[PDB]
Amino acid sequence: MFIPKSHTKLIYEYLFNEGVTVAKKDFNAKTHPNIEGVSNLEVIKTLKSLASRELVKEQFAWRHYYWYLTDAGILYLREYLALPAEIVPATIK
Amino acid sequence: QNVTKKKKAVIGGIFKAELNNFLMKELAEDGYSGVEVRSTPARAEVIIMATRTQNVLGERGRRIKELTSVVQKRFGFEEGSVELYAEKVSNRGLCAVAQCESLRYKLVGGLAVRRACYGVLRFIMESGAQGVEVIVSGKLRGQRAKAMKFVDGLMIHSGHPVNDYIQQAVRHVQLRQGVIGIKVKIMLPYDPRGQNGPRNALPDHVQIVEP
Amino acid sequence: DRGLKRKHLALIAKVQKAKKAAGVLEKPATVKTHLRDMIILPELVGGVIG
Amino acid sequence: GFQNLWFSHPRKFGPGSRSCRVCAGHHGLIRKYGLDLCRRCFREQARDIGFKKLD
Amino acid sequence: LAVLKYYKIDENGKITRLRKECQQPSCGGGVFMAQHANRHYCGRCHDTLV
Amino acid sequence: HRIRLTLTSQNVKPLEKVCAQLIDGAKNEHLIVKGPIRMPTKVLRITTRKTPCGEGSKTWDRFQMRIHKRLINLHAPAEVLRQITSISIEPGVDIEVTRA
Amino acid sequence: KEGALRAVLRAAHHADGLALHETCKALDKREAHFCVLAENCDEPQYVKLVETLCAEHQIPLIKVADKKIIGEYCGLCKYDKEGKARKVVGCSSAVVTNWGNEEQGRAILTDYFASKN
RNA sequence: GGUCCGGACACCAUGACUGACAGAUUGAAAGCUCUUUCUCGAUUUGGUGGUUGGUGGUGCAUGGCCGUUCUUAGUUGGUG
């Protein structure tokens, strides 16, 4: 999907910071409840790409995607986002 | 917030149902058994009854922390307001859901239907249940569907005592040919201490104080 | 009173333009529309609508 | 363009403005007390919600 | 590679913009407006100037 | 002042247990306690068709949830409230305090 | 000094400031600190074009003969688990809106390219 | 009738590719397309694998649920 690099930036930042990400299966919604700026469609598609690349673990229940950051994801996101190796997601802390 | 008590009760029920479904879909491999919600106005405690708390918690309790974060974000709680606690179910053999998932795993692995069903039946019976019924239905042999029932002990069907003594669970298994339904019913034993079963005896079981 | 919508106003403008760009001897060019809920106002009288 | 045409049509009322919270279906929806469950969703979830078949 | 088409390098060495630059509050120098037959269209914005 | 204790539950036994515990606490602290006032129970009924299709005899499932509400009036300006309210607690019962 | 330039460019690229088409709009805002050019740009009218604007707005530049190396000087190529430069693209020109890594070397290259100009 | 890909990921490719004033066009303020030349700039675009979605077929391939046989008193081991 065509997504601005800035929007992907915010999505990845939030995902790495929290360790998890939740999104309702609602393509039309223009505002994610937690991540600001980006739309539900962009959040869903970005994390679906992560899941396809096995960087995240996906679960679905009652019209709600839950996503868990994995170790492949923790490496990829840190290298992509250019953070120090000391920073770690809240879940690992 | 200002919400009628009727709507508060219904919201609590909806929350519990969704939480149960999500945990059932997630910790099925971890031997999930059930969930209890003590939604105190200050903090929402959620007890996850599973057979193996080790896997539920994960390495240094990371999986439970992830689940707490996900629940908070999904249900719009406040950071730290909702807390998850793992719990070890006492008798796995008397928990129908756990045995249903065990049968699911055996059938997925490829154990013969009869062998797996009889193994589960024997284990549940040795665990102390008065009776057990295991039904596996679907495309077990050939294109035509069939249902195979396994019964041992005694089992009640009609009346209120069912709600107290009978514990059921239903699951699906998707094999090459199609879906197969597993149903497990366990009649718990009469436990005066109220741990392995109901505290009150069957209404028709008159017990005599010997002189 | 609730107000005609922008599509309806555009249709009125189109029909008026077609009527203007047409001699009295001949007929105005047909204007095709999906708007079956449009009110027939004097502005439209004379024009040809599909 | 696409921005003002993809979901132009309002969905503020009617059967299309609601859905069962589990299957996203518009048919046979229970709105009493804000359940927002279909007649089939509710039969499965009633015990968990706290409804019982007394009489 | 029409980027070079909106710049005239004077023989001495300095440059002069060959296209009317935009004047929108947000987009300014750099972004150029199309050399349309009768109008000039900002690309980053609307800002049509006839 | 009149402290209002509203205890609501979907099960009578835990609700009455908690109510008795609060009453006993107040009496032990020698407070002016107003007996448990029983509000009329609220019955929420959903009647649905059992079938997931339109076929068969028309049979209906009658589900109902009951809500019981208890009122306790206390004349206690001291922090004996904090104690009596904190000690007694039970799952399935929600209690709330109001400064009427 | 190539390593220092690459390190500086990496942080700018991560910060979304590293930028032809875009490079012009960068120095029209005078947010460019410097630009890297190539002598392999066959287009004669192209080469002189970029130097003038960089000079006009007071944004001195660094010249690196061949383009393919500047393509490597972005991190925009995919690697064989060893930083192996694979499938690079021409980078005839570039701009650095915001500063990057190699703070010490970044300090050096600011003096370097300004001291000799 | 018309629009959008909301065709993940992998691989090979070749300013890749988005978007919008105005005229035309259209039921349409739909940059859908054509005139026009502007603008973001690796996300895209083309192809090959693979997915994804489907209130499409099959209830005579199935699960679950319901109805009915059947609201009647009916049913089954163990050891003999």
Write out the DSSP string of F42-63. Answer: EEEEEEEES-SSS-SS--EEEE
- Cα–Cα distance measured from residue A44 to residue A27, given in angstroms and rounded to the nearest whole number: 8
Which chains sit next to F, with 3 or more Cβ pairs under 8 A?
B, D
Residues A14 and A42: beta-carbon distance below 8 Å: no
Distance G80 CA to H11 C1' (A): 15
**Amino acid at residue number B174:** Q
- Cα–Cα distance measured from residue A84 to residue D13, given in angstroms and rounded to the nearest whole number: 50
Q: Which helix (DSSP H) or strand (DSSP E) does residue F66 occupy?
A: strand F60-75
Sheet containing strand B32-39, strands side by side: B32-39, B44-50, B82-88
Q: Which residues pair with B132 in a beta bridge?
A: B152, B186
Query: From A5, which residue of chain G is nearest by alpha-carbon distance?
Result: G16
Q: Do chains E and F touch (3 or more CB pairs under 8 A)?
A: no
Q: Which helix (DSSP H) or strand (DSSP E) does residue B138 occupy?
A: strand B131-138
CA distances from B72 to A34, C9, G69, G92 (A): 11, 50, 49, 50
Strands E7-9 and F93-99, bridge-based pairing: unpaired
CA distances from A30 to A10, A41, B132, D25 (A): 15, 8, 52, 22
Q: Which residues pair with A22 in a beta bridge?
A: A66
- Residue among C38, C41, C44, C50 nearest C15 (CA): C44
What sign does the CA torsion over B157, B163, B167, B171 have?
positive
Within 13 Å and on the Cβ side, how many CA atoms surround F32?
10
CA distances from F93 to B38, B87, B198, E49, F84 (A): 9, 22, 21, 71, 15
Q: Which residue approaches H14 most closely, CA to C1'?
A: G89
- Cα–Cα distance measured from residue B81 to residue B44, given in angstroms and rounded to the nearest whole number: 6
Q: What is the CA radius of gyration of chain G?
A: 14
- Cα–Cα distance measured from residue G102 to residue G24, given in angstroms and rounded to the nearest whole number: 25
- Token output for D35: 């359940």
Q: Answer left, alpha or beta for residue F34, where phi above 0 means left and psi between -120 and 50 means alpha.
A: beta
Q: Do chains G and B touch (3 or more CB pairs under 8 A)?
A: no
Rounded (10°) angle between helices G21-28 and G44-56: 20
Distance A31 CA to H8 C1' (A): 22
**Amino acid at residue number D46:** A
- Cα–Cα distance measured from residue F41 to residue F68, given in angstroms and rounded to the nearest whole number: 5
In this complex, which of D40, D46, D51 lies closest to F52 when CB atoms are compared?
D40
Q: Which helix (DSSP H) or strand (DSSP E) does residue G28 occupy?
A: helix G21-28
| Helix, coil or strand: residue C4 | coil
Residues D31 and D13: beta-carbon distance below 8 Å: no
Q: Which helix (DSSP H) or strand (DSSP E) does residue G108 occupy?
A: helix G103-115
Residues A32-47: b if buried by 16+ CB within 10 A, e if exposed: beebeebbbbbbbbbb
> Which nt sits closest to E21, CA to C1'?
H38
Interface check for F66 against chain B (CB to CB < 8 A): the answer is no
**Residues whose CB is less than 8 angstroms from the CB of residue A93 and which lie 6 or more positions away in sequence, other chains included:** none
- Cα–Cα distance measured from residue F52 to residue A63, given in angstroms and rounded to the nearest whole number: 21
- Cα–Cα distance measured from residue F35 to residue F27, given in angstroms and rounded to the nearest whole number: 11
Q: Which long-range contacts (CB under 8 A, 24 or more apart) does G112-117 make?
A: G112/G1, G113/G34, G113/G60, G113/G61, G113/G62, G114/G60, G117/G60
Q: How many residues does chain E have?
A: 50
What backbone torsions phi and psi does residue B2 show, to the nearest 5 degrees?
-80, 100
| Helix, coil or strand: residue B149 | strand
Q: Do chains G and C touch (3 or more CB pairs under 8 A)?
A: no
Residues G36 and G73: beta-carbon distance below 8 Å: yes
Residues A25 and D23: beta-carbon distance below 8 Å: no
- Residue among G114, G113, G105 nearest G11 (CA): G105
DSSP secondary structure letter of residue C41: -
* Residues C35/C37/C43/C46 CA torsion (nearest 10 deg): 70
Chain G residues touching residue E9 (CB < 8 angstroms): 45, 48-49, 52
Q: How many residues does chain G have?
A: 117
Q: Which long-range contacts (CB under 8 A, 24 or more apart) does C25-33 make?
A: none
| Helix, coil or strand: residue A15 | helix
Residues B193 and B185: beta-carbon distance below 8 Å: no
Hey, how many other C-beta atoms are within 10 angstroms of the C-beta on G37?
23
- Cα–Cα distance measured from residue E6 to residue A35, given in angstroms and rounded to the nearest whole number: 41
**Residues whose CB is less than 8 angstroms from the CB of residue B177 and which lie 6 or more positions away in sequence, other chains included:** B138, B139
**Residues whose CB is less than 8 angstroms from the CB of residue F55 and which lie 6 or more positions away in sequence, other chains included:** none
Q: Answer left, alpha or beta for residue A62, where phi above 0 means left and psi between -120 and 50 means alpha.
A: left
- Token output for A32: 């994610």
Write down the residue that tokens 């299966």 correspond to. A25
Q: What is the CA radius of gyration of chain E?
A: 12
| Helix, coil or strand: residue G114 | helix
- Chain D interface disruption, residue of F59, F60, F65, most D CBs within 10 A: F65
Q: How was this structure determined?
A: cryo-EM
Distance F57 CA to H70 C1' (A): 14
Rounded (10°) angle between helices G103-115 and G2-15: 110
Strands B32-39 and A56-60, bridge-based pairing: unpaired
* Helix, strand, coil percentages, rounded to 5, for chain A: 40, 15, 40
Chain F residues touching residue B36 (CB < 8 angstroms): 91
Write down the residue that tokens 């518009």 correspond to. D26
Residues B122-139: b if buried by 16+ CB within 10 A, e if exposed: eebbebebbbbbbbbebe
Inter-chain CB proximity E7 and G28 less than 8 Å: no
Q: Which residue approaches H45 most closely, CA to C1'?
A: A2
Query: Resolution in angstroms for this experimental structure?
Result: 2.6
CA distances from B44 to A37, A84, B2 (A): 30, 35, 18
Q: Where are the alpha helices (DSSP H) in chain B?
A: 5-26, 53-57, 62-74, 96-109, 113-126, 161-165
Chain D residues touching residue A25 (CB < 8 angstroms): 24
Residues F63 and F30: beta-carbon distance below 8 Å: no
- Residue among F34, F19, F39 nearest F75 (CA): F34
- Cα–Cα distance measured from residue C28 to residue C16, given in angstroms and rounded to the nearest whole number: 9
Write down the residue that tokens 């406040």 correspond to. B78
Residues B161 and B202: beta-carbon distance below 8 Å: yes
Which chains sit next to E, with 3 or more Cβ pairs under 8 A?
G
Inter-chain CB proximity G20 and E3 less than 8 Å: yes
Chain B residues touching residue F96 (CB < 8 angstroms): 41
Chain G residues touching residue A82 (CB < 8 angstroms): 10-11, 14
Residues B182 and B106: beta-carbon distance below 8 Å: no
- Cα–Cα distance measured from residue D41 to residue A62, given in angstroms and rounded to the nearest whole number: 11
Q: How many residues does chain A have?
A: 93
Interface check for F96 against chain B (CB to CB < 8 A): the answer is yes
- Residue among B82, B94, B97, B90 nearest B39 (CA): B82
Q: Which residues pair with E21 in a beta bridge?
A: E32
- Residue among D43, D38, D34 nearest D22 (CA): D38
Three-class secondary structure assignment of chain D: CHHHCCCCCCCCCCHHHCCCCCCCCCCCEECHHHCCEEHHHHHHHHHHHCCECCC
